Amino acid sequence: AEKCFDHAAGTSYVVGETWEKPYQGWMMVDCTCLGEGSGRITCTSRNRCNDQDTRTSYRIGDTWSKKDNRGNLLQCICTGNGRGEWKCERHTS
């Protein structure tokens, strides 16, 4: 039973396990254990859209406005369709 201690989490995950692990501070992705030799963990966010503009990981079916780099406001949404395709649509007035 190769465990995948996430250390910063202080929790183990027997091979073939999956849990939640906040990335930087607000980000969050599903860290899965695959046991390679010392405890490898494939963390990926396919169902947890995360925007680095508001510093807040959204969920599936959620929605949040997020400008780009000019000052507009792309009303993005975590459509979640296979890998969290949270798209962003500027204000189309």
Among 2.10.70.10, 3.40.50.300, 3.40.50.2300, 3.20.20.140, what is the CATH number of 1-46?
Answer: 2.10.70.10
Structure obtained using: NMR
* DSSP conformational letter for 20: E
What residue spans in the chain does CATH classification 2.10.70.10 cover? 1-46, 47-93
Within 8 A by CB and 6+ apart from 87, the residues are: 76, 77, 79
Which structure tokens are listed for 62? 């959620």
Of 38, 45, 30, the residue nearest 80 (C-alpha): 45
Sign of CA dihedral 27, 72, 61, 82: negative
**Residues 7, 63: Cα–Cα separation, whole Å:** 32
**Residues 74, 84: Cα–Cα separation, whole Å:** 17
Q: Locate tokens 């079916």: which residue? A: 61
Q: Does domain 47-93 have CATH number 2.60.40.10?
A: no
